[PDB]
Amino acid sequence: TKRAVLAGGCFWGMQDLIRKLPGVIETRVGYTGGDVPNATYRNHGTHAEGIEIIFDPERISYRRILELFFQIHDPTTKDRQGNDIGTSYRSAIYYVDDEQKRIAQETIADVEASGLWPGKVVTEVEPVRDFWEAEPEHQNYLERYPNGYTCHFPRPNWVLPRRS
Amino acid sequence: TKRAVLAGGCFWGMQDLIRKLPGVIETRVGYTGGDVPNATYRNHGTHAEGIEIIFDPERISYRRILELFFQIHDPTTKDRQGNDIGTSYRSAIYYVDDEQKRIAQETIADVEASGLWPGKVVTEVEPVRDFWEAEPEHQNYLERYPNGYTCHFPRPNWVLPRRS
Ligand SMILES: [Ca+2]
Numbered sequence: 001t002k003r004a005v006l007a008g009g010c011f012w013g014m015q016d017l018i019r020k021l022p023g024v025i026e027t028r029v030g031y032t033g034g035d036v037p038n039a040t041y042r043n044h045g046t047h048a049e050g051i052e053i054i055f056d057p058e059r060i061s062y063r064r065i066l067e068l069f070f071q072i073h074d075p076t077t078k079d080r081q082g083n084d085i086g087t088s089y090r091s092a093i094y095y096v097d098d099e100q101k102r103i104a105q106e107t108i109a110d111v112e113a114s115g116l117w118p119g120k121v122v123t124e125v126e127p128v129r130d131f132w133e134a135e136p137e138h139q140n141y142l143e144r145y146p147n148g149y150t151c152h153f154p155r156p157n158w159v160l161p162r163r164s
Numbered sequence: 165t166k167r168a169v170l171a172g173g174c175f176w177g178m179q180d181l182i183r184k185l186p187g188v189i190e191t192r193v194g195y196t197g198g199d200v201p202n203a204t205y206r207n208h209g210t211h212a213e214g215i216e217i218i219f220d221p222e223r224i225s226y227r228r229i230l231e232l233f234f235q236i237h238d239p240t241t242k243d244r245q246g247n248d249i250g251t252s253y254r255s256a257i258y259y260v261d262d263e264q265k266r267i268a269q270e271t272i273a274d275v276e277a278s279g280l281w282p283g284k285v286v287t288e289v290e291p292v293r294d295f296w297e298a299e300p301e302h303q304n305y306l307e308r309y310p311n312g313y314t315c316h317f318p319r320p321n322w323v324l325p326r327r328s
């Protein structure tokens with residue numbers, strides 16, 4: 001099993017869509033990429049709202065996970081996703097090892113080369129650090145409240161050639 | 165990754181304890197081992213309340229999972245766990261393959277040979293069949309309500325010699 005850690009806006013919508021990818025085993029939302037320990041919803045400093053994804057690499061690749069990531073959030077808006085404004089809502093990939101770093105960089109290069117997205121990619125690429133799991137009320141929120149708030153959705157136009 | 169499927173009483177308490185075992189990646193509660201399709205909380209016929217456990221076999225063994233199972237529920241009471249009475253609350257191991265069947269049988273034999281449990285083991289051993297995931301409100305219930313109802317707890321006396 002493998003771990004991916006991503007940020008791309010309100011974490012409810014991230015989990016709602018990413019949990020559906022075949023080969024994803026577990027998802028949990030939380031605060032990561034920032035300063036303060038013991039982060040919480042109303043007190044997480046410079047952390048992004050993010051998601052930790054445990055997946056089966058035999059069933060799904062890291063690359064395919066990143067492709068869904070770039071399909072479901074606008075990676076071109078700095079410190080904002082849709083209606084949600086602030087550093088909490090920024091786009092970031094938190095790589096767990098060198099292979100993930102390389103694939104993240106290659107994938108961003110492919111995204112930009114396509115010209116399909118609305119401007120330069122502003123997604124951060126950083127090593128993963130502490131992941132502060134969000135409060136239980138945030139986990140699986142859109143399972144318990146299927147009509148709840150989300151600004152994430154898969155754009156059919158935000159897809160890459162599948163050369164492999 | 166590997167899958168284990170167990171039943172041993174109210175599924176809230178099962179998930180609360182089993183989710184804490186290091187090497188367990190995901191848990192989900194549901195209805196399994198019985199008759200009716202599309203099972204729900206108030207309409208699941210002869211199904212047991214059960215739990216599906218996805219684990220990393222490099223970190224935790226199936227045997228160790230069964231050992232926790234036999235530690236946290238009384239496997240000697242037919243169609244009952246603590247205050248919860250009925251076939252919904254019965255003890256069962258739903259094996260996913262022949263290796264799990266063999267380990268389940270060996271583990272039950274070890275349990276009985278020890279004489280530490282309060283009577284013969286009545287746990288069913290059956291091949292896994294459809295697992296009807298429970299409603300979102302049941303998932304992670306004792307995370308959202310940490311003081312909520314449970315009759316599960318680890319008995320320090322319900323442990324086996326660790327010969328390996
Ligand atoms: Ca989960």
Ligand SMILES: [Cl-]
Pocket residue numbers: 139140141303304
């Ligand atoms: Cl939940």
